[PDB]
Each structure stands twice: as C-alpha cells, then as structure tokens.
Amino acid sequence: STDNAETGVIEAGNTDTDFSGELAAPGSNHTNVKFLFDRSRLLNVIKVLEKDAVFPRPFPTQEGAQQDDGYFCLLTPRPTVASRPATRFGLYANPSGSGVLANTSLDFNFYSLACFTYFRSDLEVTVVSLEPDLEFAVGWFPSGSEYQASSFVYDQLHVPFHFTGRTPRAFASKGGKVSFVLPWNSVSSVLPVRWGGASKLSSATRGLPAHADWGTIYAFVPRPNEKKSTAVKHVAVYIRYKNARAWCPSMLPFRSYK
Amino acid sequence: GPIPTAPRENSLMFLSTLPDDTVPAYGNVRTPPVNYLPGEITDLLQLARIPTLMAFERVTYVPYVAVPTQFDDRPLISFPITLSDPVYQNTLVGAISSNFANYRGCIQITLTFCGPMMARGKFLLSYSPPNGTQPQTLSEAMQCTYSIWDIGLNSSWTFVVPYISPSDYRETRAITNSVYSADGWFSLHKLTKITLPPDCPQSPCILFFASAGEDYTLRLPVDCNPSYVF
Amino acid sequence: GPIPTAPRENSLMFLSTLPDDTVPAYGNVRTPPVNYLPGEITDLLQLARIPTLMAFERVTYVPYVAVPTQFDDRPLISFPITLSDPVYQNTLVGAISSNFANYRGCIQITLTFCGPMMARGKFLLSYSPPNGTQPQTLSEAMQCTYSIWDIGLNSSWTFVVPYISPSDYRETRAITNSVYSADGWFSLHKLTKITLPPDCPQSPCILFFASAGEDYTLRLPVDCNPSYVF
Amino acid sequence: GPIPTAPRENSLMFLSTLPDDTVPAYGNVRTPPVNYLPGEITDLLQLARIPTLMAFERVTYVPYVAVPTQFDDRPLISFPITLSDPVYQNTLVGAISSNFANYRGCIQITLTFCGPMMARGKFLLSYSPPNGTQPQTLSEAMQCTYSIWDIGLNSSWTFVVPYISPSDYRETRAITNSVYSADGWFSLHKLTKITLPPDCPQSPCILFFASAGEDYTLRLPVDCNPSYVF
Amino acid sequence: RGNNGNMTFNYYANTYQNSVDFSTSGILNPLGYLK
Amino acid sequence: RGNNGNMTFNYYANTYQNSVDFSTSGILNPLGYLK
C-alpha cells in the first residue's frame, strides 16, 4: 500500500489490506512488562565476614592502604566495581601480575531487555550458601549511609558492632535460606538506565549517577573475633524485581556480526 | 487447641518462578509521585511495532541495496524468513523475539526509494512458500504471491508476509530446517530498467524497514544470551 | 483430617524488624494507672521544633559572636547548610537528624541582640544557593535572597531557609558534596557600624538559635553512632 | 499472632497415588483449541466392547477352526473361561483386563460361517458350570445351558455367557483354580454332518469373535507387565 | 474431577493452576455408525 | 496483577506489603503523533 515513511508515523496493517484474507486471534499476553520482570536471577557472589571490616576508600586510592575487599555487594542492575558504582564494565582476561583484582557485576538479562530509559520497582532479595552446612547471617543498610566499623568487649570477647542496629539483620538455621523484600528508598523518583548528567557541580564525572541503587548487603559469621578460621567462604545473592514500570523507549545492545 | 497438619513432600524448596510474594522487612515507606513523566510503556509490543533498518553485505555492512545496471534474470536480492537469520538480527523485531520461544501474526516489510525525483521505474515483490528449491526467475516468481510497485510521487511501499503455517504458533529459532521454523523466502525483482535524464548520477539506492504486524504476538519467555558483552 | 501445607523457603529465620508479635508467657497482669503524669510526648518532632543554641570557635567554643570594630568587606560569619556540619552538631535538630537518612521542609534560624539598650545599627542576612565559589562581598550578597534587620525595641528576628532542591527529600549527611547533600551557604553582613554613647562598653555580642520549621519532616530510621561513650 | 499447630507423624512423605495437586511453576499459558478432532474417548469400556479375533493351535496359530469330516463324539473344540487363558490373550477384553484385578458382567462370544453358500448344517453350543470333570459327550452337553444354531441366510450367531458366581466380582487371573477364578468351560458340538453338492471344496472353516457384554465392569487398577519389549 | 480428593478449597487461580484453550472468533455414546 | 497467583487472601496490610506515592495538594495506545 502506498505510504510515506518520512512522516515518522506509519499505521500498522493486516493481510486483508491488499489481499483476500483475515486477521488472527489475539493469543496470549506474555509480553506484559509487569509480568515479564518478576523472576529471580543471580546478581553477585561475595565472601563472609569473620571480624570487623574496613570499608574500601574512594577510587583515587594509592598503594599501601589497608582495607577489606570483596565483602560488600551493591543492589543495582548497573555496572559496579570494587563495591562502588561505575560506568564501564570490567573483565580480567589475563589473571597475572601484581595488584588487587577488582570485583565486578552486571545484570545481563536486564540489560538484554533494557529497551527503555527510566525504571522503578520494589525488590525482593534472597541468599544461598555455597559451602556444606554453613551458619551465617545477612545485614543491610539503606542508600546514602555508611557501615559502622568498631567492636565492643564482652567478657574479654570482642563483638563487632554490626551485630546490632535499628536497620534489618536476619539469621538462618543450618543450611537455611534468607528471604525478604525492600521498598524503593532512593531520593530520586526513578532509576536511570542510562544517564548523561553530573552530580557534583564541578570536577564531576559525567554520566555517573550518585544514588541509583536500593542499598547494600553483606554477610557475617555470628561468632566473636577470637574464632577467625583459616578458609574463605562464599554466598550467592538473588534479586527479583516486583511491580515494575518503564517510562521511555531506547535501543538494545549491538549483537556483533562474526 | 493446635490445628493438626502434615506438610507435603515439597517443603523448604526455593523456586525462582514461584507466583507469590514474601515477608516484608522495612515497610511503611512512602515515595515521591511520578505523575510528571509522560510516555509510560505498558507492553513491549508497543516497541516491537516500530520499524527499523535491516542489514546486508556490500562485498562490511550497509542497510541499503544498490540497483545495478546489468541485465540478468536472477532475483535482485533474496533472504529467508527466519527470525534467527542475520538480516533481522539487529532489528527490534528479531532482537526482542530472540528472548522468547513462539510467535504468531503477520510480519511487515517496508521500502523507500531515495533516488532523484526525475527517475522512473517499476519493481516486483514476491513471497514464495517453502519448496524443494527456491525461485530463480520471474516466470516462477509471478505464480507465487506478489505485487507490483511503481516509482511515483509517494516514496514508500509496504508489504505484508501472510501467516501461512501448518500449526498454531511457530518456533523463533532454527536449529534445523523443520517446517515449523523456516517459512520460505522473500525476493525482489527489477521488472524494468531505470530511466534517467542526461547528467544525473547512476545506480540509485533503495532502503528497507522491518516491523511487527497488527496481529503479532509472542509467548513463553526464555533466558537470554550474554555474549554481547565480549 | 490434617490440613496439608508446604512451608516456604523462609522458615526458622529470625528477622529483627519483622512487623508482628510473638507468644506470651506470663499474661493476665494489671498495672497501675498513669493518668497523673502530664505532658505525654507523641512524636519527636514536638522536640525537634524547639530552638537551641549553636556553637562557634573563639580562636575553645562559645554560642555567641562578637561584633568587631574594624571595617572590612568580608562576611561577618558564614557557615554551610549541611546537617552533618559541626555548627549544628549539638543542636536538637542536628542531633535527632543524625539518626535518620532523609529530610524535607524548611529550616529556621533566630537571632537575639543582647547589647546596651542605647545602641543602634543594622544588619544584613543572606542565603546563597550553591555556586562555584561562595559569596565574598555585599554587592554579591544583595542579589541572592536576603533581608534587612534593624536594632529596635524588640530584640529577636527570625529567618527561614527555603527548601529549594532538585529532588524530593535530601540526604542528612555529606560523604561527598553532591547536590543532594550540600545546599549552599548562609552569611551575615554588618550593613552599618554600631553607634554608642560615651562611657559604654564596646563590642556587643549576638546570639543564635536553630530549630525545625513548620513543614519539617524526617524518614527512614538508621542505626546510631555510640562513640559518645568514649 | 502466629497460629499454633502440630504436624502429624506423616510429614515429608512422598506418596505416588495421593489424590491432590501441587504448586505451579510456569502458569498463565494458553493452548490451541482442539475442537477439530472427532471421536474423543471418555472410557476404555468403549474400546473393551468391540469384538476381536481369538486364536488357536493348528498343530503355528490361526483364528479359525476347520470342521473335519470324521465322526466322533468328543467336542469339536473346548476352552476354559479364564481371562488369563491364552485364547483370550490377544483379544482386547483380555488385554485390557490383565491390567486390573476384578470384573463383573456377562462375556459375549460371536461366530461367523464363511463356507460356500450352498452348504447346510447345524451346530450345538453349550456352557458348562464347574464340575469334577468337564463334559465329553452330547448327552452330557444337552443338560447344561446350550443353544442350537443352524446355517441359513444370515452368517453370524451371538452367544452370551451368564455371570453365575458365588460372590460379587471375580479375579481376573488364576494363580490357582479356586472357584473365584475359573468358571467352567465352553464347548462346541457338531450336531449333524455338513452337506455339499458335487464339485465343491471340503472342510469349511468357522471364525470366532470375543467382546465384553452390556453390563461388563472392571475395578481396582494394578501395575502392568513389561515383558512384551523382549 | 479425576483422581482429585479436595472438594472445598482452591488456593491458586484457575489460569495459573491449569492450561486453557484460547478462544477463536451419563451413558457412553457409540463409535461407528451404519445407515 | 502480575506474576502473582493468589487471588483470595492477603495477610499483611497494603502499606506494609508495598510502597505508595504520597499525595500532593484494553488495547494499546500509540506513541508519537502527527497532526
């Protein structure tokens, strides 16, 4: 049928427009945005704390600084590095040489279906053990805060402060699982899938949002400082968006042609 | 008194896709209003129904095709109808479809002529259901479903691929060429040579767009391929 | 017959913030009445809305500021607007706010002149939204939001810092000077020098108070810092 | 507050035959309509009530029996009434019955004469309830339940084995010849010799069919025997 | 109907418990007829 | 609505199960118009 594509708006047609025929029945509605995104998926894998921690310093950190790495996980589909927001995803193709290796993460499915510009939704978290018959706990604090770092002495046994606080802490039995849901607590109204502004008024890095996440999570062993074991331990984190919404179209990744 | 009950064999299991909620932890939160943002998307079909540019090989890829001047009986260009085929790879229809397993409805194709206003010509578009061998001449093409499009004032012309299938729903990827994945070919034929006045550039170019139809539908989500990050 | 049921993946978990109760052990107790105690507090905002004294450095801290006699164009005193700043540290507004994460509404400042009844003068108060560099002269100060306050019979004068923010709610601590934590500066300018009759003490003093506004609000509790015990 | 309950001794058990459902995982799926397929089966009795061919030994198996020309007083053919007997093995009634444990109702037998149209004769069919020894002569056969069938225009003749049992329901397999498994014998007697005109083939053949009755019924499913695969 | 004992309560919705066919726009009867 | 199968019973209150926006004082419609 004759038409002009330069106008931008083109009306969708059917088989009957130019030939003899008829339209098909609806079928099913599995493409609904709310129904599509309510499925759990892996996000990151982190270690388990066995003592009081030292939060990593900002990125301009030079050598020789003492801190703990790979113990904290951010809750956000965007790329991150060293437990802090980033802009470019990383990958170590040559595990050799000096220097500490930076943790990295990303939400492959979310960015494979990230066809829009802005997003908002609640979020449900779950954790799972990767070691046989392990006892652990999980802690959390909201966006725009920091982790207290010190300990107290009870009966000559040091006890880290992160045991107590008015922000959720949860315990699981031998081989159990931890589950709960969180609200949308960032100051911004919506989470930007892609951004092009600056946060600070000067010396800022363009395109790096400040508070595009839900919070922060970590795991620890409920024992005093006197029982620091000899082997490292790991856990896995699962997230699941709930009651999602989208606001403005965009484009999808570039599938390279061999 | 206590209510006596017996848990089933399925207890303490963690199922990712389970259709139910869980226990809250930090409720009673109130959030800013979002009335000010326009253009809320309710279904991804709204985006699947927007035309986009396809790709071809210039031997190293371009969206358009250059009309030659030589005379031959082979089709000017022909590609299969299979959403996993490279030509549809980067278009929205294909990109979204690769995340599901089945589809219905009618696909839509659009063209636009971007040559000098002084040119004149005609083209033939045909769609051939599956056969032992694909069409290779105008005489064969005429018999299948086809239409004639002539250059005039208006620049674009839309074509609809009917949904003719032996079964409801069809696979969106072709591990093997069963009748449920591949559905024939599409080919374009130059009916008459182009006429141009003296002192004009030769070899005009033609452009392609691909989009979903009115009655298009998807179903049965599936996990996605992360190879793009490399 | 037993009701068949299947417990979820989240069982035997201990969650501190869970919104529900537990099983009693020693119920049926009755307690004395408490009708005789007046002044029940229902919300901590009732206490957040009471003015209190700020602090400054005399170089080793005092709540007031001494008006000099020299002449210069710099502001008499200027401090940032950030609830984590030391000046607000001991005031109730800051002390309570340090236990939460977000806030809204308008902050309020109050002054009182405690000099001899025979003195006369005028002062200029200004509030500068964020910029590359903070104001440093009266000409610049006049342009921002400001007001003129003159010594008279009444002793005190109140000032309101409007809530002008790029987003609803703002952070209550400044790990880094993003636009969501810092919100400009406040500065005081001596418009005219003070006039005193002969045989009177020089260098009068001025006093500050800080309190929450009418539409102030807090949100999202957080755990507190125990360093005070040391 | 939490509802207090105490699970029973039977918890976490997996029971294959339990009459209840389980938790879904991938719901919300919609399937194609199936209105176009005719002949839906609702109960397997519909198939159990269709006649089929039995088998015998020609000494190496055929469904028919050849009428000899010699004269003797023994029954032409006699087989027991026990669904596990080889003769019923391949017929539908027996094949389906082997998957259950009990049965009721009346069995049905049918015959058809496939000889030359010019022949004439008569046959005697009898059914003998259980006894110490099975019948062996016409005089004995006449006393039991029996009927006379004569060759004529119509070719077939149906016979019904009454359900005469000391108890409701009966076993469908005979581990031992208790009165609840075996139920007598069936035998066929040639009353008169066949008459044929000159120049015609001798020794006509007769054919058998077996099927369930009107009031047939099965009960109590049981697991099946997989030996056929070898 | 079927090998299902419950007759009082259903938790999940029908469209999630079972599959359905999308629309388009007693004694046993015999099989095989003669006329 | 959504990937939620329950349709009969809710235990916790709405303001605790979900987040809400504080007040202030069918077929798919198209995106992009021409006039």
CSV table of C-alpha atoms in Angstrom, one decimal, chain A residues 13-157:
chain,number,residue,atom,x,y,z
A,13,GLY,CA,-1.8,-3.1,8.7
A,14,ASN,CA,-3.0,-6.6,8.2
A,15,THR,CA,-3.1,-9.2,5.5
A,16,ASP,CA,-6.5,-8.2,4.2
A,17,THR,CA,-5.5,-4.7,3.3
A,18,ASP,CA,-4.0,-5.7,-0.1
A,19,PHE,CA,-5.1,-9.3,-0.4
A,20,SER,CA,-8.0,-11.5,0.4
A,21,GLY,CA,-7.7,-12.8,4.0
A,22,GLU,CA,-8.5,-12.2,7.6
A,23,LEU,CA,-6.8,-11.3,10.9
A,24,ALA,CA,-5.6,-13.8,13.5
A,25,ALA,CA,-6.8,-14.1,17.1
A,26,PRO,CA,-5.0,-12.4,20.0
A,27,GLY,CA,-3.4,-15.4,21.7
A,28,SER,CA,-1.6,-14.7,24.9
A,29,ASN,CA,-0.1,-11.6,26.6
A,30,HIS,CA,3.3,-12.8,27.9
A,31,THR,CA,4.9,-9.5,26.7
A,32,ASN,CA,3.4,-7.5,29.6
A,33,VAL,CA,6.2,-5.5,31.3
A,34,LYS,CA,5.0,-6.2,34.8
A,35,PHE,CA,4.7,-9.9,34.2
A,36,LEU,CA,8.0,-10.2,32.4
A,37,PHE,CA,10.4,-8.9,35.1
A,38,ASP,CA,9.0,-10.8,38.2
A,39,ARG,CA,11.6,-13.6,38.1
A,40,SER,CA,14.6,-14.2,40.3
A,41,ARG,CA,18.2,-14.3,38.9
A,42,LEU,CA,21.8,-14.3,40.1
A,43,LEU,CA,23.5,-11.0,40.7
A,44,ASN,CA,26.8,-11.4,42.5
A,45,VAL,CA,28.8,-13.7,44.8
A,46,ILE,CA,30.5,-12.3,47.9
A,47,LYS,CA,32.6,-13.6,50.9
A,48,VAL,CA,31.5,-13.8,54.5
A,49,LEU,CA,32.8,-11.6,57.3
A,50,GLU,CA,34.6,-13.1,60.3
A,51,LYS,CA,35.7,-9.8,62.0
A,52,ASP,CA,35.2,-6.1,62.0
A,53,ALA,CA,35.6,-4.7,58.4
A,54,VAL,CA,37.1,-1.6,56.9
A,55,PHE,CA,35.0,-0.1,54.1
A,56,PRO,CA,37.0,0.5,50.9
A,57,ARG,CA,38.2,4.0,50.2
A,58,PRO,CA,37.3,6.1,47.2
A,59,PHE,CA,38.7,5.3,43.8
A,60,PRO,CA,41.8,7.6,43.8
A,61,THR,CA,43.3,5.2,46.4
A,62,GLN,CA,47.0,4.8,46.1
A,63,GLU,CA,49.0,1.7,47.2
A,64,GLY,CA,49.7,0.6,50.7
A,65,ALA,CA,46.2,1.4,52.1
A,66,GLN,CA,44.7,-1.3,54.3
A,67,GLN,CA,41.1,-2.3,53.8
A,68,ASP,CA,38.8,-5.3,53.1
A,69,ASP,CA,37.8,-6.1,49.5
A,70,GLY,CA,35.0,-8.2,48.1
A,71,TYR,CA,32.9,-8.3,51.2
A,72,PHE,CA,30.1,-5.9,50.2
A,73,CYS,CA,27.6,-6.1,47.3
A,74,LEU,CA,25.5,-3.3,45.8
A,75,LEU,CA,21.9,-3.7,44.8
A,76,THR,CA,21.6,-2.2,41.3
A,77,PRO,CA,21.4,-3.5,37.7
A,78,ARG,CA,24.1,-1.0,36.6
A,79,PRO,CA,27.7,-1.9,36.4
A,80,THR,CA,29.8,-1.7,39.6
A,81,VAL,CA,33.4,-2.1,40.6
A,82,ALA,CA,35.1,-2.6,44.0
A,83,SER,CA,31.7,-2.2,45.8
A,84,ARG,CA,31.2,1.2,44.3
A,85,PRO,CA,29.2,2.5,41.3
A,86,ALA,CA,31.0,2.5,37.9
A,87,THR,CA,30.3,3.4,34.3
A,88,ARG,CA,32.2,0.8,32.3
A,89,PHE,CA,32.1,-3.0,32.8
A,90,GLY,CA,35.3,-4.7,33.5
A,91,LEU,CA,36.9,-8.1,32.7
A,92,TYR,CA,40.2,-9.7,33.6
A,93,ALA,CA,41.4,-11.7,30.5
A,94,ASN,CA,45.0,-12.2,32.0
A,95,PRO,CA,44.9,-13.2,35.7
A,96,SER,CA,48.6,-12.4,36.4
A,97,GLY,CA,50.8,-9.8,37.8
A,98,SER,CA,50.7,-7.6,40.9
A,99,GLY,CA,47.8,-5.5,42.1
A,100,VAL,CA,44.5,-6.4,43.7
A,101,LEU,CA,41.8,-7.7,41.4
A,102,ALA,CA,38.6,-5.6,41.3
A,103,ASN,CA,35.2,-7.3,41.8
A,104,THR,CA,32.7,-6.6,39.1
A,105,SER,CA,29.0,-7.3,38.4
A,106,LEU,CA,26.1,-6.7,35.9
A,107,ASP,CA,22.6,-7.7,35.2
A,108,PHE,CA,22.9,-9.5,31.8
A,109,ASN,CA,19.2,-10.2,31.4
A,110,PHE,CA,18.1,-6.7,32.5
A,111,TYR,CA,20.4,-5.0,30.1
A,112,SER,CA,19.5,-7.5,27.3
A,113,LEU,CA,15.8,-6.4,27.7
A,114,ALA,CA,16.6,-2.8,28.7
A,115,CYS,CA,14.6,-1.1,25.9
A,116,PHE,CA,13.6,2.0,27.9
A,117,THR,CA,15.2,4.9,29.7
A,118,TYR,CA,13.7,5.1,33.3
A,119,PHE,CA,12.7,2.3,35.7
A,120,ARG,CA,11.2,1.9,39.1
A,121,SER,CA,10.2,-1.1,41.2
A,122,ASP,CA,10.4,-2.8,44.6
A,123,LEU,CA,12.9,-5.6,45.1
A,124,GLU,CA,13.0,-8.9,46.9
A,125,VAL,CA,16.3,-10.4,48.0
A,126,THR,CA,17.4,-14.0,48.8
A,127,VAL,CA,20.7,-15.5,49.8
A,128,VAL,CA,22.1,-19.1,49.4
A,129,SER,CA,25.2,-20.8,50.7
A,130,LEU,CA,27.9,-22.3,48.6
A,131,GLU,CA,29.5,-24.4,51.3
A,132,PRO,CA,28.2,-27.6,53.0
A,133,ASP,CA,26.5,-27.0,56.4
A,134,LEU,CA,27.3,-23.3,57.0
A,135,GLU,CA,25.9,-20.9,59.5
A,136,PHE,CA,25.8,-17.2,58.5
A,137,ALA,CA,23.7,-14.0,58.7
A,138,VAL,CA,23.0,-11.1,56.4
A,139,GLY,CA,22.9,-7.4,57.0
A,140,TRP,CA,21.6,-4.3,55.1
A,141,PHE,CA,21.5,-0.5,55.3
A,142,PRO,CA,19.7,1.9,53.0
A,143,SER,CA,21.0,4.1,50.2
A,144,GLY,CA,23.1,7.0,51.3
A,145,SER,CA,24.6,5.8,54.5
A,146,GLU,CA,27.7,4.0,55.7
A,147,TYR,CA,28.8,0.9,57.7
A,148,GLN,CA,29.9,1.3,61.3
A,149,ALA,CA,33.4,-0.1,61.9
A,150,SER,CA,34.3,-1.0,65.5
A,151,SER,CA,33.8,-3.6,68.2
A,152,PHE,CA,32.9,-3.9,71.9
A,153,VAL,CA,34.4,-6.1,74.7
A,154,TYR,CA,32.0,-8.5,76.5
A,155,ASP,CA,33.7,-10.9,78.9
A,156,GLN,CA,37.0,-10.3,77.2
A,157,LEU,CA,35.5,-11.4,73.9
